[PDB]
Amino acid sequence: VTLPFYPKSPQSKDLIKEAILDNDFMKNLELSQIQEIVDCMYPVEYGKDSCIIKEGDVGSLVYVMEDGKVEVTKEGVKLCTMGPGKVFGELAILYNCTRTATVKTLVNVKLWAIDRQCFQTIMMRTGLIKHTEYMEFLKSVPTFQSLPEEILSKLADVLEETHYENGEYIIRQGARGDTFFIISKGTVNVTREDSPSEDPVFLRTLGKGDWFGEKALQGEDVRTANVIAAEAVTCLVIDRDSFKHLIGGLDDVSNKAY
Amino acid sequence: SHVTLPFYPKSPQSKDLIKEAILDNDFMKNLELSQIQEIVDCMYPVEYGKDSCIIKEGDVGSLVYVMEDGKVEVTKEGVKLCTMGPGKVFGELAILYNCTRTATVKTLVNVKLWAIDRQCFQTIMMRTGLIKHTEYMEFLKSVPTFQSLPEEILSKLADVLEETHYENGEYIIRQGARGDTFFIISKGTVNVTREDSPSEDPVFLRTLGKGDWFGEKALQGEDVRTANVIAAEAVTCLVIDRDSFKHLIGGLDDVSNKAY
Ligand SMILES: Nc1nc2c(ncn2[C@@H]2O[C@@H]3COP(=O)(O)O[C@H]3[C@H]2O)c(=O)[nH]1
Ligand SMILES: Nc1nc2c(ncn2[C@@H]2O[C@@H]3COP(=O)(O)O[C@H]3[C@H]2O)c(=O)[nH]1
Ligand SMILES: Nc1nc2c(ncn2[C@@H]2O[C@@H]3COP(=O)(O)O[C@H]3[C@H]2O)c(=O)[nH]1
Ligand SMILES: Nc1nc2c(ncn2[C@@H]2O[C@@H]3COP(=O)(O)O[C@H]3[C@H]2O)c(=O)[nH]1
């Protein structure tokens, strides 16, 4: 789930993005995917008179040329030459076939390359798939599985993923609140101080699929307890208005008692 | 070269069901029409009884399904995701995205499915207009007469050429007939014959094949064909209208000054 990263100059990052936006087979990727491809590519060089791609071979890498010149042949027929700012080697990866042509260096070249597995991983990181994963998660939460699909979908549309370090206060008692939290990862501790000048008392531990932060949205806008990450925690979070329109009605949430 | 996909004859009602199911699927509705058609024709029938597991999450994906009758249940790690009825695609994610099955699919009743194998799906995914256009380009470049034409002109040729198929024995061109088209042979072979008068039998002139062309003479004189061109085996020509011929190919010395 975690991709390789290679640091690049803005000029390089722009060259690659423009190369992709110029390529007829890839120009319609979502922007976030282009961005991920951009950061993922690692640098590769070849000297003059080298063969980068042999037709018939297994394709593994997709290239963007930053510097140099290559010649593209197929069955001995010259197809074209390509200069900087062009993608090549994407067909074998996009279409799961062998290399459809041969690419040779005419000079020393400087390429950026991404391997097949990274590319395929990124191809699946679309808005529609992220949305679907949010839906699948929500359906796993008993409070929300029973909701109509349209409302789950509306929820999935607005859900924000936030992360908390161990010991981090997700919620402090006594402050206003504007967020409702669903735990997708890890555990939290809930504590409360009854009077001022006192140490907070432990109430309970919540984990994956549990939720919190409704009290300040239902009633007075003051947090009634502390919620502290007890390990590395991920929450799916909902702003006050979304809560009100989409979730505020639910009996299990509205009439929650402790 | 090219693979031939299997054809499975289906009722009109089924073909429409499949077509609609794809166009209703968010991961597939943006396929070209030609691709959706090809999927339609190459899906084959498969049935399952009540309480069968069609797809297990984690497995390598092989087939994409379209349901015509019945109801299936979709779960992931035991979480119920949905039920699906007729007119729905399932099993496309593993194949589209080269991952393992992302969920489990089980039947609730007897089901009637249409299925497409991964060999076909992979073939069809690559049959786009753009890929076809590029194949046209690569072919023209293999023909020395059309190689050295600028890229802009080859691209225009690919835009307007018509790929046409001919039966064995078919007169692609009859001597004496009016003509408006130029032909480039992309596949197969033709025989060229000519008769001195129409009350005489034609004599053999020559045999042409892939990368050869014909039909230029009637575009350069009065539009009358000066010989017969007859398909020998299965023949494919890239066919070019008169105006496109004049603007794009007519200039070429090899074509203009072709002598026989
Ligand atoms: N088949 C083909 N490839 C080309 C052409 N122009 C440059 N290329 C690149 O050369 C590459 C060969 O490896 P790939 O088939 O994976 O991807 C190809 C393209 O990205 C062309 O006109 N035809
Ligand atoms: N008042 C109270 N809040 C709790 C308890 N256990 C979990 N919580 C959560 O801790 C949260 C503090 O922020 P909110 O008061 O807005 O909403 C609260 C609840 O959702 C409990 O026993 N008492
Ligand atoms: N991951 C996922 N698959 C679903 C869902 N609804 C129905 N499906 C189908 O279940 C199938 C499992 O095999 P695939 O992962 O190949 O493709 C999947 C879909 O076509 C859903 O909400 N999530
Ligand atoms: N007149 C003539 N045409 C030929 C000969 N060999 C192949 N051809 C082709 O057959 C075609 C008949 O249609 P066209 O006269 O338009 O153009 C002709 C040529 O392109 C030949 O020896 N004589």
Q: What is the CATH number of the domain that holds B199?
A: 2.60.120.10
Is there a single domain that holds both residue A144 and residue A87? no
Is there a single domain that holds both residue A25 and residue A55? yes
Is there a single domain that holds both residue B191 and residue B76? no
Q: Quick one: which of A145, A148, A127, A123 has its CA closest to A136?
A: A145
Nearest residue of B to residue A101, measured between CA atoms: B138
d(CA A100, CA A129): 30
Q: Which of B127, B159, B177 is the last residue of a domain?
A: B127
Helices B33-42 and B12-23: crossing angle in degrees, nearest 10, is 130
Ligand nearest to the CA of A213: 2
d(CA A94, CA A10): 27
Please identify, by atom number, the ligand 1 atom nearest to the C-alpha of residue A100.
15
Phi and psi dihedrals of A208, rounded to 5? Answer: -60, 130
To the nearest whole angstrom, how far is the Cα of A76 from the nearest Cα of chain B?
9
CB A136 to CB B26 under 8 A?
no
Beta bridge partners of B203: B194
Is there a single domain that holds both residue A84 and residue A141? no
Q: What are the pocket residues of ligand 2 if the criterion is a CB atom closer than 6 Å to any ligand atom?
A: A 171, 177, 190, 203-204, 212-216, 223-225, 227, 258
Is there a single domain that holds both residue B161 and residue B95? no
d(CA A10, CA A52): 26
Based on the structure, what is the number of domains in chain A? Answer: 2
CB B126 to CB A97 under 8 A?
yes
Tell me the Ramachandran region of residue A240: left when phi exceeds 0, alpha when psi lies from -120 to 50, beta otherwise: alpha
d(CA A43, CA A40): 10
Is there a single domain that holds both residue B92 and residue B178? no
> What separation in angstroms does the CA of B129 have from each of A130, B126, B159?
30, 9, 10
A220, amino acid identity: E
To the nearest whole angstrom, how far is the Cα of A140 from the nearest Cα of chain B?
6
d(CA B211, CA B69): 49
Q: Quick one: which of A153, A117, A166, A155 has its CA closest to A237?
A: A155
Greatest alpha-carbon span in chain A? 85
The residue of A79, A91, A98, A133 whose CB has the most chain B CBs within 10 angstroms, and thus the best one to mutate to test that interface, is A79
Chain-centre distance for alpha carbon B155:
19
B96, amino acid identity: L
CB B122 to CB A77 under 8 A?
no
Is there a single domain that holds both residue A219 and residue A101? no
**Span between the terminal Cα atoms of chain B, in Å:** 32
**Domain extent at residue A164:** 126-258
* Tokens found for residue A188: 């939290």
Is there a single domain that holds both residue A247 and residue A153? yes
Is there a single domain that holds both residue B198 and residue B71? no
* Tokens found for residue A60: 């593994």
Chain-centre distance for alpha carbon A102:
34
Beta bridge partners of A192: A201
Is there a single domain that holds both residue B249 and residue B135? yes
DSSP three-state, residue B106? strand
DSSP secondary structure of B1-20: --PPPP-----HHHHHHHHH
Residue of A124, A140, A145 with shortest CB distance to B97: A124
* CA neighbours closer than 13 Å in the CB half-sphere of residue B24: 15
* Tokens found for residue B2: 């090219």
Q: What are the pocket residues of ligand 4 if the criterion is a CB atom closer than 6 Å to any ligand atom?
A: B 173, 179, 192, 205-206, 214-218, 225-227, 229, 260
DSSP three-state, residue B132? helix
Q: Which of A61, A94, A125 is the last residue of a domain?
A: A125
Q: Which of A94, A125, A156 is the last residue of a domain?
A: A125
3-state SS track over chain A: CCCCCCCCCHHHHHHHHHHHHHCCCCCCCCHHHHHHHHHHCEEEEECCCCEEECCCCCCCEEEEEEECCEEEEECCEEEEEECCCCEECCHHHHCCCCCCCEEEECCCEEEEEEEHHHHHHHHCCCHHHHHHHHHHHHHHCHHHHCCCHHHHHHHHHHCEEEEECCCCEEECCCCCCCEEEEEEECCEEEEECCCCCCCCEEEEEECCCCEECCCCCCCCCCCCCEEEECCCEEEEEEEHHHHHHHHCCCHHHHCCCC
DSSP three-state, residue B178? strand
CB within 8 Å of B134: residues ≥ 6 apart: none
Method of structure determination: X-ray
d(CA A143, CA A211): 9
B215 and B221 Cβ atoms separated by less than 8 Å: no
Nearest residue (CA) to ligand 1, atom 22:
A79
Nearest residue of A to residue B142, measured between CA atoms: A77
d(CA A70, CA A46): 10
Is there a single domain that holds both residue B118 and residue B40? yes
Would the CA dihedral through B78, B82, B88, B89 be positive or negative? negative
**Span between the terminal Cα atoms of chain A, in Å:** 37
Beta bridge partners of B46: B113
Is there a single domain that holds both residue B119 and residue B195? no
Where would I find the H helices in chain B?
Answer: 12-23, 33-42, 93-96, 118-125, 129-142, 151-160, 217-220, 242-248, 253-256
Q: Which residues of A touch B141 (CB under 8 A)?
A: 77-79
